[PDB]
Write a protein that binds this ligand. Structure first.
Ligand SMILES: [Mg+2]
Ligand SMILES: [Mg+2]
Ligand SMILES: [Mg+2]
Ligand SMILES: [Mg+2]
Ligand SMILES: [Mg+2]
Ligand SMILES: [Mg+2]
Ligand SMILES: [Mg+2]
Ligand SMILES: [Mg+2]
Ligand SMILES: [Mg+2]
Ligand SMILES: [Mg+2]
Ligand SMILES: [Mg+2]
Ligand SMILES: [Mg+2]
Ligand SMILES: [Mg+2]
Ligand SMILES: [Mg+2]
Ligand SMILES: [Mg+2]
Ligand SMILES: [Mg+2]
Ligand SMILES: [Mg+2]
Ligand SMILES: [Mg+2]
Ligand SMILES: [Mg+2]
Ligand SMILES: [Mg+2]
Ligand SMILES: [Mg+2]
Ligand SMILES: [Mg+2]
Ligand SMILES: [Mg+2]
Ligand SMILES: [Mg+2]
Lengths: 116, 94, 54, 58, 84
RNA sequence: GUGAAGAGGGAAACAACCCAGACCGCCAGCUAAGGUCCCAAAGUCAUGGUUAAGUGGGAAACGAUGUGGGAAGGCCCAGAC
RNA sequence: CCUCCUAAAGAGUAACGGAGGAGCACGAAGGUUGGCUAAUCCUGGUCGGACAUCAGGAGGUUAGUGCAAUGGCAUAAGCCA
RNA sequence: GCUCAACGGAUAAAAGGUACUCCGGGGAUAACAGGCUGAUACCGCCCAAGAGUUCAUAUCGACGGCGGUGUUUGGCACCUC
RNA sequence: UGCCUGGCGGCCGUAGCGCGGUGGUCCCACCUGACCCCAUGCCGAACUCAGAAGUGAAACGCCGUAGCGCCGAUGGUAGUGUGGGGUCUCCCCAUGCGAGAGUAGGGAACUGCCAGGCAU
């Protein structure tokens, strides 16, 4: 399955981060929405979460599944992390090729202030 | 159709069981049912003679312990490896 | 010395209770006679056992 | 607080070194030596270990 | 039939034992860099603060106390160092 | 574990087996192993069985109406063997 | 010199004990990043079959690991770039 | 830069005979005898296919099995070099 | 608060498989099309991008099912540490530890954080 292959791809970097203890900015890209979360190193506590599924972000977007929606959601998640003082995270692409919407989200977060 | 007079075991374990089997009795268990299992102390010679019938392992035995009758089935039998003796009998409450 | 020996025959270690030979389709007395004849050729004490449900 | 008395009734010759060390821990020194100790689970364990060669007057 | 016969053997070879196995057992307190287990292949895996060398030797990377646990979906055995 | 490098008592004799670790003396007592008829210290001790083979006091498959105990079973005063 | 067993569930442990290998290879067969997952069998299919390539399924790592055996390996240590 | 591979590597550089022998030692280690053991050897016995005109057991006795002796060939290396 | 969905875990088969059913407002998936960014040792299959017509078909989620997988007592048995004993290449007794298999039985997971949807 596609998602099984994606999980298999992601697991290595996820375990490396999980043992390193880095706060994790995990992305999740779908054909329509792109989700971003920042999660504690233990993995069982969601620090912040910004997604196109929610009205506050979506209402400023034409289509929720493209590079511009990704840039908007990355900007939002980075600003909320900076308001929670998260400051320094590490990027978990979750198997998605770091390119296109995922890369645009990453650059939006980097310019907003998240360090990775 | 067969009635088996049984008495309650006082001590369990390898030593007590081998003491029984030397003293011409043998341990048995009554499990199954909705209550805790009961360990009993059967009379080896009578039980061997009565199990000689092939319907012992088919009809519902009755066990008389402390006057209380228990209707059981013969579930499993452990036999001596090279003797016509019994070592243990599993009864199921029924 | 000078190494181990060469394989000469094959055995099957027998412990008490092991049911060596089994037989079916014959009368019981003839089975007893046949088993007596067979046991006379073996170096281990034996006995005659029957089938039971359990 | 309760005290038991332990009397060595057999030799320590040919015993396992662990048995000899248990005898020493109990403080017993020779056959017919009686010592007084406290009644603790540890002491009971020592006595159980060397129960074949000591007698206990509880 | 007088004296004897004769006959060489083809075996009689072996290698120096490598002294593998668990060096520091569970509950022990190690210094940083202490070898916890020498092994062939990750029979034991590297948990928290435990590093795996090239020969799959597990060494504690932080001071503390050893801790074995069955972890993961494959019920593998992980050595971790509780912070002490 | 013992002997080696440990004597003493027992196993007849018998380093290595069982009991037990000799500082010296005593014409004192209690014991371990092992024993108590005589050699040879100590029960011709008490109770209930077994063996009739000198078994005890060397040895197997196998054989046998030896004898003792046990749980059954078969045929029987229309009187059975 | 390496691997398994003997080796008595820590380490170690002998024999003219039972089995096998080494006296190298690689500039990539190393590093990293990204990606991928095997054997076998069945079905269908030009030459072309028991075994060539193609497609589907069952299967589940019974594969692979430059070379022995063991321990590992799916996050792959296996296969490409 | 050593197949110094007898791989902790005596020299850079080394094979044999002695019944013509000699010395120091050993029963630490062989041949002879003794000893322990009894694979082998020898002698018994158990089951009994079959042979024996029929009939296993007059006489043999297969396929197997269990012992005895210390009578050969041995094993070990305890006494004696 | 209730229920559904998505993500990250906890845990690692009482949690997996099979079989039957069910879901599309939201989510997810399939889907539509490739100047493009990006791509196939050929192929927009996969990866990627721009989208949203349609369908939950497959997948996934959930529900129900014991046919398996899985877990699993009590009892007994095997083994075994220490001390004894026997006709001792194997056993037995006192005491301590006590399985494996099997039996009754359980069993179609449970659970935390965040977000969205619906009914509030
Ligand atoms: Mg016992
Ligand atoms: Mg060797
Ligand atoms: Mg000397
Ligand atoms: Mg002496
Ligand atoms: Mg000494
Ligand atoms: Mg003496
Ligand atoms: Mg004698
Ligand atoms: Mg004397
Ligand atoms: Mg002294
Ligand atoms: Mg006296
Ligand atoms: Mg006298
Ligand atoms: Mg070992
Ligand atoms: Mg050991
Ligand atoms: Mg390689
Ligand atoms: Mg590599
Ligand atoms: Mg040399
Ligand atoms: Mg050398
Ligand atoms: Mg000379
Ligand atoms: Mg000699
Ligand atoms: Mg000689
Ligand atoms: Mg001789
Ligand atoms: Mg002599
Ligand atoms: Mg002499
Ligand atoms: Mg069990």
């Amino acid at each position: 399955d596609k998602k099984s292959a994606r999980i298999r791809r992601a697991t290595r970097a996820r375990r490396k981060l999980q043992e390193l203890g880095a706060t994790r900015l995990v992305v999740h890209r779908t054909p329509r929405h792109i989700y971003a979360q920042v999660i504690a190193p233990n993995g069982s506590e969601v620090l912040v979460a910004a997604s196109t599924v929610e009205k506050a972000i979506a209402e400023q977007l034409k289509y929720t599944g493209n590079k511009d929606a990704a840039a908007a959601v990355g900007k939002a998640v980075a600003e909320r992390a900076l308001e929670k003082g998260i400051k320094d995270v590490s990027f978990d692409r979750s198997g998605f090729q770091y390119h296109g919407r995922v890369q645009a989200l990453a650059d939006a977060a980097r310019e907003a202030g998240l360090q990775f | 159709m067969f009635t088996i007079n049984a008495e309650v075991r006082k001590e369990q374990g390898k030593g007590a069981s081998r003491r029984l089997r030397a003293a011409n009795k043998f341990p048995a268990i009554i499990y199954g049912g909705k209550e805790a299992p009961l360990a009993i102390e059967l009379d080896h010679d009578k039980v061997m003679n009565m199990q000689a019938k092939a319907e012992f392992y088919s009809e519902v035995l009755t066990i008389v312990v402390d006057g209380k009758e228990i209707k059981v089935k013969a579930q499993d039998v452990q036999r001596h490896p090279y003797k016509p003796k019994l070592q243990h009998i599993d009864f199921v409450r029924a | 010395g000078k190494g181990k020996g060469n394989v000469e025959y094959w055995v099957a270690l027998i412990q008490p209770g092991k049911v060596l030979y089994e037989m079916d389709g014959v009368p019981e007395e003839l089975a007893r006679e046949a088993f007596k004849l067979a046991a006379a050729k073996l170096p281990i004490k034996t006995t005659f056992v029957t089938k039971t449900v359990m | 607080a309760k005290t038991i008395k332990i009397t060595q009734t057999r030799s320590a010759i040919g015993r396992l070194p662990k048995h000899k060390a248990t005898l020493l821990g109990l403080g017993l020194r020779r056959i017919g030596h009686t010592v007084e100790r406290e009644d603790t689970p540890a002491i009971r364990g020592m006595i159980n270990a060397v129960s074949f060669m000591v007698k206990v007057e509880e | 039939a007088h004296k004897k016969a004769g006959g060489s053997t083809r075996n009689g070879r072996d290698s120096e034992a490598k002294r593998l196995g668990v060096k520091r057992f569970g509950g022990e307190s190690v210094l940083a860099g202490s070898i916890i287990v020498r092994q062939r292949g990750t029979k034991f895996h590297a948990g928290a603060n435990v590093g795996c060398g090239r020969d799959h030797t597990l060494f504690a990377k932080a001071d503390g106390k050893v801790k074995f646990e069955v972890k993961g979906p494959k019920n593998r055995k992980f050595i971790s160092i509780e912070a002490e």
